[PDB]
Design an enzyme around this catalytic site. Sequence first.
Site, mmCIF file in Angstrom:
data_model
loop_
_atom_site.group_PDB
_atom_site.id
_atom_site.type_symbol
_atom_site.label_atom_id
_atom_site.label_comp_id
_atom_site.label_asym_id
_atom_site.label_seq_id
_atom_site.Cartn_x
_atom_site.Cartn_y
_atom_site.Cartn_z
ATOM 1 N N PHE A 1 -29.428 0.086 9.357
ATOM 2 C CA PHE A 1 -30.558 0.175 10.291
ATOM 3 C C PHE A 1 -30.565 -1.088 11.197
ATOM 4 O O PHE A 1 -31.564 -1.376 11.864
ATOM 5 C CB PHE A 1 -31.875 0.464 9.565
ATOM 6 C CG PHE A 1 -31.752 1.601 8.571
ATOM 7 C CD1 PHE A 1 -31.312 2.860 8.976
ATOM 8 C CD2 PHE A 1 -32.047 1.407 7.229
ATOM 9 C CE1 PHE A 1 -31.194 3.914 8.058
ATOM 10 C CE2 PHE A 1 -31.898 2.451 6.305
ATOM 11 C CZ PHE A 1 -31.463 3.695 6.725
ATOM 12 N N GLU B 1 -31.882 -1.897 4.016
ATOM 13 C CA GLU B 1 -30.637 -1.845 4.812
ATOM 14 C C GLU B 1 -30.777 -2.389 6.245
ATOM 15 O O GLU B 1 -30.561 -1.636 7.191
ATOM 16 C CB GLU B 1 -30.004 -0.415 4.845
ATOM 17 C CG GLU B 1 -29.318 0.061 3.579
ATOM 18 C CD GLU B 1 -27.886 -0.399 3.395
ATOM 19 O OE1 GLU B 1 -27.673 -1.598 3.096
ATOM 20 O OE2 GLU B 1 -26.975 0.456 3.490
ATOM 21 N N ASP B 2 -31.101 -3.685 6.405
ATOM 22 C CA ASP B 2 -31.246 -4.372 7.702
ATOM 23 C C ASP B 2 -32.375 -3.835 8.603
ATOM 24 O O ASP B 2 -32.296 -3.962 9.827
ATOM 25 C CB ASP B 2 -29.931 -4.453 8.507
ATOM 26 C CG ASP B 2 -28.872 -5.385 7.957
ATOM 27 O OD1 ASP B 2 -29.193 -6.579 7.693
ATOM 28 O OD2 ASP B 2 -27.705 -4.962 7.880
ATOM 29 N N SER B 3 -33.423 -3.255 8.019
ATOM 30 C CA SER B 3 -34.584 -2.898 8.816
ATOM 31 C C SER B 3 -35.681 -3.856 8.364
ATOM 32 O O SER B 3 -35.476 -4.586 7.387
ATOM 33 C CB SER B 3 -34.948 -1.412 8.738
ATOM 34 O OG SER B 3 -35.242 -0.892 7.452
#
Lengths: 1421, 134, 107, 87
Positions: free
Chosen positions: A472, B3-5
């Site tokens: 994301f 996850e990278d949010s």
Amino acid sequence: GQQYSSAPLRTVKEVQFGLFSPEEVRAISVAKIRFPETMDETQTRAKIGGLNDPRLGSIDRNLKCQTCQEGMNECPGHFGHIDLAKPVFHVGFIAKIKKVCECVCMHCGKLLLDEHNELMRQALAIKDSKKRFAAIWTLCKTKMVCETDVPSEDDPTQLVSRGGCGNTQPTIRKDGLKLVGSWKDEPELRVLSTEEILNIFKHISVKDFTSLGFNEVFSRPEWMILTCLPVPPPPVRPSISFNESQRGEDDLTFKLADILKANISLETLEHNGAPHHAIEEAESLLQFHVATYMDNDIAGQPQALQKSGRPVKSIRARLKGKEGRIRGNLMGKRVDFSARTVISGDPNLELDQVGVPKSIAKTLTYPEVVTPYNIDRLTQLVRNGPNEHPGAKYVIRDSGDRIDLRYSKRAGDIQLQYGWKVERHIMDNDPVLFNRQPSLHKMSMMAHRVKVIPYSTFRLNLSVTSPYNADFDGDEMNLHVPQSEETRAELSQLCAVPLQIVSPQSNKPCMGIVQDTLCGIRKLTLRDTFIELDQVLNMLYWVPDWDGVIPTPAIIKPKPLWSGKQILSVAIPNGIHLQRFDEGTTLLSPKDNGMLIIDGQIIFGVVEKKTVGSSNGGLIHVVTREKGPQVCAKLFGNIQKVVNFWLLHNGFSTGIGDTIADGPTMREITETIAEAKKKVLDVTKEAQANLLTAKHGMTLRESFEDNVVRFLNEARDKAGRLAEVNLKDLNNVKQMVMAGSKGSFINIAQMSACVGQQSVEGKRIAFGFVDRTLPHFSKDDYSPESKGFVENSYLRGLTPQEFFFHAMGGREGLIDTAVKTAETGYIQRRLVKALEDIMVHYDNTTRNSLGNVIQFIYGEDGMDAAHIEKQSLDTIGGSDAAFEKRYRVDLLNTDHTLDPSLLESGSEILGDLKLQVLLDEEYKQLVKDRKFLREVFVDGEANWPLPVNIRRIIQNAQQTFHIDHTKPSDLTIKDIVLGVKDLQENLLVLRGKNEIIQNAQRDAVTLFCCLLRSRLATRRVLQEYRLTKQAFDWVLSNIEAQFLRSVVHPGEMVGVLAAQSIGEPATQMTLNTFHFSKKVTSGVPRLKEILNVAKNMKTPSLTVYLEPGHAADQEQAKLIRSAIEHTTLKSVTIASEIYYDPDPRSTVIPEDEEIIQLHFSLQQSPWLLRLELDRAAMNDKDLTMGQVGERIKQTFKNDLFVIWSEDNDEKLIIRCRVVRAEEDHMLKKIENTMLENITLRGVENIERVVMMKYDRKVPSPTGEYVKEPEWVLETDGVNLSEVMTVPGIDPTRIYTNSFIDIMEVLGIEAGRAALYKEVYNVIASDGSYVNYRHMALLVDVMTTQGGLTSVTRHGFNRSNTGALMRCSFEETVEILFEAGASAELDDCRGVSENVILGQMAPIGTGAFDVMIDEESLVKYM
Amino acid sequence: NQEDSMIMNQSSIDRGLFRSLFFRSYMDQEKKYGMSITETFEKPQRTNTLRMKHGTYDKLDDDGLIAPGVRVSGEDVIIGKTTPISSKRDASTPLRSTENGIVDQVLVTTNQDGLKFVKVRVRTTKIPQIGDKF
Amino acid sequence: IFVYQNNITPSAMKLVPSIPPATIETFNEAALVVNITHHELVPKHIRLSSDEKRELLKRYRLKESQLPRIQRADPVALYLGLKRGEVVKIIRKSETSGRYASYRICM
Amino acid sequence: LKEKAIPKDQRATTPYMTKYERARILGTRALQISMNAPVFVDLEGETDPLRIAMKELAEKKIPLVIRRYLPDGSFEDWSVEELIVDL
Ligand SMILES: [Mg+2]
Ligand SMILES: [Zn+2]
Ligand SMILES: [Zn+2]
């Protein structure tokens, strides 16, 4: 497209490629294109009777077409024609035209070599239309006489006239787009006129040209030369006409006007006052424009650039791939009903859902047909309008005419009618294809359930992150909306997320629990973790399925408390049974190690990556295989919903505190690094003092550097391991490493303790400056500090030097990554384009678009890779005594029968001779199996992926029937023995009432049955599992059912599967082969090496195994090392000298004064050649002076007089004099032959030979497999043919990474075996696993046509496959040109052809036909 | 925030966190086709056969330009221009479909040639949302 | 079968197809030192009779072209003295089934 | 030729329905149902053409037949009625 036509609608079954005859071009034409002009004559801006012109199609939106009067959309366009003033070569056939000229007499048109010539007779016999023309050409090209007469087949003395003139043939050369000949004081040189070439071609007999590659009907050689040029209609060269006073003609329209202009120039020039050397000028020009129109990017010629200087789009260049018509407009297309936005994950969506932003849902539509079922709903959506969410955009009437709900004045009073289509908004639960590019997987495109949501991002379940390879970090994804009730069915029934869960790539699941949920699941499932009622009730409610039953708490009396394990088992469904042992897990699991789930309840063990991840024996892998893909997808959500909720309330973090290691532990690290630095210095001084002895086949430098980098690495590893141990269980980094959610040892090591040695190109930072890595260091500084060892941790911070050396190695990473992304890209495509058309047929066979057999049954077993699991073959391992105890039943031995405690019959079964005959045969078979398995898996490996999880069946049976491991079974010996025997007959893979198909069946089930017989032996069934008749009968019916389910489905596009299954893992490779046994080239570069079938490979090597009764003896190994490793005279020589020693009886050199006196007790050249040899060099290679001497002696025989010093004399010398004007100059030639040419010992190419004590699992006398280490020789060169015959070796075991060589010496079959091994070893080295069948299929494809077919442009793409199919990869236009010239017929069975033709491909769902049976229809009504 | 949010404070976003301005400048010229024949900046209208844009012309002033205060949207015509053929033909500039904002600054000058030159800038404030990168 | 040490002159080599139907084989002594068929990687190749081959093609509905090939010069093809068209049944051990049989037609 | 059709007796493809044959039967039937074709099963309040098709398949009241093509071009026809639906 669009209007109705009475014409019958059919599908293209065949494509007949051929060449245009000028006659056709004229017949087919609608206009004689006369003028370069496009319009504006008489004033009127409207198309002229010359170029473009109405006769061809419309420029305007006129409705007029003159020809069909149909109008732009409906009209395809019609071809015009230009009659050329002189014939011209079709640019794409100039080389073929030259080769035809080279084969035929340039005067009488006869094929230069008759069926009178024997070699020609063989060449003529060749059935391949192209290979024949190749053989014919090679034979005729070097025939410069058109023979009148030739020697007769009967007798060569009395010659027979074969016909044809007696003219000399020219030596043809290509000079631009002209052909020049050279006949035979001095040769005659002249250009061959296009007319002349054509005339000769027109004179070639049908029988002659059909003997060449040509075709009487479709491609006569004379049609390679152009006289009548077809003029493509406006839709090929669209006039982009902006405004009224402006136009914008296409490149092709200009090039055609250029052709036209050049042609009129020529025709007016030749007709009028022809200066004849100005005529040839204009003709060359017309040849240029007709050439340059079709292909502008011609070899070593100038480009035909535009006004602008812009090169001009050639028709060729239009079709030339990646963006050509083929690759970009046909194999790929930009498509309608598609959407794209940023993705962001959601814990509250189900695995198979996809969050669609309202705006996107409001744009994309589904065409639903008004029917009594939806008529009511559909009128509401139409009422709602195109602006409200559940609404619609258009209403399509019976008339086929579209109603725009945005503007229709009747948008409010629309009354739908059955048959009309309502193009409604995409609503919740519509199946849609969701995709993250690059699409390297089957799983990179999966079908999801729509969930219309607010906000502008596509939302996805986190567990589906892994198959897509989505982050994301700002990633975007594509959504494709199907439009048919049929294509939806395809998405839902074939590619929906739950189905795609257990992937056939690795026979394991491709989705598991990740990140927060993985981290939190370990945390929840601890012995220490307990939950108070308040929260237990919330954690229960959160599970959407939860039966409404509050579980009884693990702790009752002090305080009602539940365990993590407990309430997580609420998400685990009943009948789920898992068992796993880690480190030292006992049934009283002391460390909370392993995993034990019974009836879907956790008994012991922490739930982490090995359990709840995407593991081979997974909680996921089992829940799918046991309960359904649906049930499993629910479990993803349930596990998430609970764990995520618990973690939301427990919390989780990380800080600098988590990188901080203990004060004394830091002291210990600083010391560890320090002592390693000193261990390095001690070696550094040892090498500087010339005391360091070099390693075999290594420089002193190579040896020293190896030790250094080995110490400095040992150091980093130890230092890290100190922090790793010292980090408490409360360490957040350690906690993530433990669950397996993120991080590993090296991450901890580098951040907390020591970063380690930096490396570029396999070696420590090199002296970029003269003898120093940086100007900050002194010269010749080999220290850890100088060559880039990063002493510090990330926590401590790097020094300026450390920082730069880190940056140097770091950059090498970024490049290597960039380069691999490229390299792997192409590898994937060539793999796919090479396997496309491979499918499983309704006969269980594996074939291509030619119907050629690749695999006789998919992956040698005929099973679908997804339905396979690693299982243990018990009969293979252990002692024969232990096997006996396990499987032997002897009703004739009072203490080797089955005790009556085991079965009812027990008491009466003792002594039953007839029954002992059954158990005797049963056991004789179990013994047979054991010896067979040991032949198959030589290492005694028992864990092999097979199709039916028999352990689980017996498990479930015991649970199902509440098997009491106390009371005796009701089974009979015959019940078990014959029941198993009968089951075997019903495990059908191939059905066919014949000995071939039946023996095929027997083979396909050979391994599975071995396992079956192993697990269902009489003693096991009664003593181990305590099965009742009922339970047993059930185990059998289930094994049968499950087995049948496991077989491959005809239609399975097994080719693309295999391609992608090798390709996608390649894209995930770090590489090359560490930063340092043998250092063989591996990963991406070795995979490239393999698929290319590269002859000159980077690391060629042999693995020579010693003779059976010699494995332990190191001296035997040394002997062979000595016998095979190549040694030259050059390697033992210090210096070579030439002296003038005129008296052979005396010597000017006083050293040799002793050497002469002896070799002259028990006419020659006065010039002496003296060689000094190195004692040290002779000692490493264990050579004698006489050994060397004799070798020189036999090289020159009686032509050179050789004397030599003895192995004792202070200086090692060899004296040489020549035997029997200009003599000195000869000795220098001898000294070169001596050093360069001469071989002392060893086999050529075998350059460095290493001794290795390899471990080997071998059966012991007692029976059990045991580690029996053997000596082995590793080469640095290949000569298989020669090292095989060497004595003392095992030539039955010798291996080589060069499979090209194995193919050559041991046959294509062994070549295949080695090829598999080498492909497998690329994949296995990166850790990753790919199921046998995939790699097998690739290997099988590269081998079916006897020999090594590369996965390249000239490998697979040069097959007898579809012309259209092959043009879709790499040689496109060239391929299609040859298609016409050789009149190829595309069968249309390749996926690619049907993709190009826009037809339903014979793939999966297209592998069969559906018909309505009126009989059954009338029977149902 | 998996996850990278990342999760962002809605309350803070309101209070003005990571909120930004955005400007886009659109430009045009009165081209001189041949001699005397020149393009004209004006608000056009349905006259004989002029290929006019679908967007709202009503936001334009008589100079064929929007006033700086005005709020624009979708395919609204921000610069009105006509090209003559031998009545008129449309050559007007509409705001980028995929965009909307408020007309910021309108610049009326002359290009070196001596012909009318125009630059229209449109300002939009972009508040941090759910798909936004940081 | 002629087992030659170093070479057979091309003048002598002319005589090989000179006396049909009888076929002549030329084998270099040096190649024969090791029986390649004995190798780990070399499976068992079985020559099929006219009838055996006919049945193969019948039972899999095959044209000879469809069958996987073996070069007439392939080491194992030479060993078994395979002529063009002769089909060989290759029986290899499998990690998937226990035993798998492929077929290779000569060239 | 009509040596193409392999007879009912001596037929050898799976007596089971392939994942693809199911996907295409369900799709085909749902498409037909969707464009107002007569339904052979009693819709017990059903409305989605796929759900109706599934009911049709479940009751083996689908009047379609699969023509299974062999690599040579021959074929075995199998009725939806007779094929085993394990899947
Ligand atoms: Mg990214
Ligand atoms: Zn037309
Ligand atoms: Zn001739």
